[model samples]
Target: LLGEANSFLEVLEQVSHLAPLDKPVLIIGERGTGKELIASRLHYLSSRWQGPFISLNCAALNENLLDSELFGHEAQKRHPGRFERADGGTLFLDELATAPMMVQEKLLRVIEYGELERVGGSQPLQVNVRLVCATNADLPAMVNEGTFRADLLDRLAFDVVQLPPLRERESDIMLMAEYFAIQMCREIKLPLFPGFTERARETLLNYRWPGNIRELKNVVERSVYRHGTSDYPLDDIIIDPFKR
Candidate 1:
């Protein structure tokens, strides 16, 4: 909800139209742009807020585990796959481009029919679910390269939200900085909060945050922990946090 710049509100306004619909939505953004939060908003703001909003990380799991995780293994008594688990609600697939091609094929079927059977099982089970996915990869190029399927991309992008980068969100930086400062101060049981100094404000505004919101949050929290009890400039806020 840190959309103080009105840039995010504009995107949210676009998303509100499709929030209530039970279709696939694709959230496109760079790493650390907070697309996952937007995906959560899409589910929570909808009528399906009462239902489960399952989140699956497509990039982390191995091929075998990911397949079974998505479509499930064959056992009547076992837990159902993600699609079935997300029935009557929303399933958020984070890093959709990293999932294997086989996993994608199974996902496509679920997207199209809302019914998919477990492995080594023939009976198809019907389930109602809204699929939401976030990706940092260039999917059109992946489609051309034969890694990602076009049919799946076509279905998932029925409603697409291209998240704005941090550089473009100029008005949001200081707002986000202040918010993080107060939040961090509160965690340490500090009293009489000290706001950002002039030098700190200048440093924040001039820098190009490649890591976006995530990086900004880290820098603010670190700065606050060091000199948050009283007002101080960001003496060591990391613009590019690379450590060896």
Candidate 2:
């Protein structure tokens, strides 16, 4: 949200336009590109803002576990899953490419019919939910490889919002660097953000920053803390602490 770049602004505008729709949205970006941030904006700004916002990372669970977690399992005792919990709300699925084929089919069923049968249960439970999914993988390529379901992809991809990597938003690099530096300064009881020196600024802008915003935050904050005082502008930009 702290960006002034046109590329960043365009994505924000896209989010604004798509937030109000009840359709499922797919967010595609590199790692650390703030996919979840945009996803939350979509949920909070939508008509279902007051309803629950439930999220799950498919990367952390196996096929069976993910299926049960998403659709719940009935084993003599009744338990509700993420879809049920997200009734009248938004359900965000992170790293969706990791979901197994069975889960993908079930996800398609839910999207198509607004109903799902809990794992190990025959009865279809009705749910009203908005689905939002994020992934860093090249889904089209995965589909070509036959590992992902094209139908599910089509359902989730009613609209796709792509995030610009930090390097692509050059205007935001220093803006966010200054923002992070100021927060770090306050942590040390500093009076103001002294700012970065010309050399440090050059270093910041020229670097590739493969890890994107998260890495930039870490580097800038680490440099500020190591600078240890607000007596002068920060002259150091530590791209990597381990190398030296």
Candidate 3:
């Protein structure tokens, strides 16, 4: 969310514009692009800020369990699902492309009619939820392969926020690198961060951060920790820790 790059700023603008729209939003980005944080920002900026915000990772479970967790189950005592828990609020579904066809059907139904039946119960329940989904998968390709529901895709695409990778945000690299360095300093009980050495700065700028800001954060933190309590400017830049 912090960047001066035009691409990153445009993404922030898109989020601000779509925050209060009360529709399903799809966040498209590669791994480590801060998709989950963006989803949270969307929720807090909306009128439903007072309502509960629930998040579920679809890739964490299989079809049956994912469906049960999503729509609740009637076994023994009736348990409410995330959609019910997130009622009148935002429900953020991460790794959404992994949701099976059955779950997709129920999702579409809920979006269309605001109604859903529990896993084993026949009685329908109503939930007023603002849906937000994120994924790094090729959803269009999934639809073509028939693994994903086209109808659900249509409903979820009310607005799409595409984030630029860190390589494209060259202006923010040093800013974030310094930011991460100071944070790591606090973690290591250092009173002050002496900042990056000139060569280290160039090294950071010269690399291609495929893992984006997340990767940069790791690299910066590693370099700062290696500097220890000597209080010298950080000089080492280790892009791959595995390589000695």
lDDT of 3 by residue, 1-244 (tens): 5678888888888999899989899999877888888999899999999999899999999888898889887755777889989999999999999898889998898899988864443678899999899998899999999999999999999989998888788579998988898899999999998877889988988898889888999998888888886468888888888996
The candidate that achieves the highest lDDT relative to the unseen native structure: 2
The better candidate by TM-score, 1 or 3, is 3
TM-score for every candidate vs. truth?
A: 0.90, 0.94, 0.92
Q: All models: lDDT?
A: 0.82, 0.90, 0.88
Worst 10 residues of 1 by lDDT: 231-240
lDDT (Cα, tens digit) per residue for candidate 2, span 118-224? 44436789999988999889999999999999999888999999998888995799999999999999888889878889999999999988888999999998999
Q: Candidate 1 — which residues are off by over 4 angstroms?
A: 119-122, 231-244
Model 3 misplacement above 4 A: 119-122
Q: Report the Cα RMSD per candidate.
A: 2.3, 1.7, 1.9
lDDT value for model 1: 0.82
Model 2 — which ten-residue stretch has the worst lDDT?
114-123
Best by TM-score: 2
Stretches of model 2 off by over 4 angstroms after superposition = 119-122
Which lDDT value does model 2 have at 167? 88
Clashing pairs counted in every model: 0, 0, 0
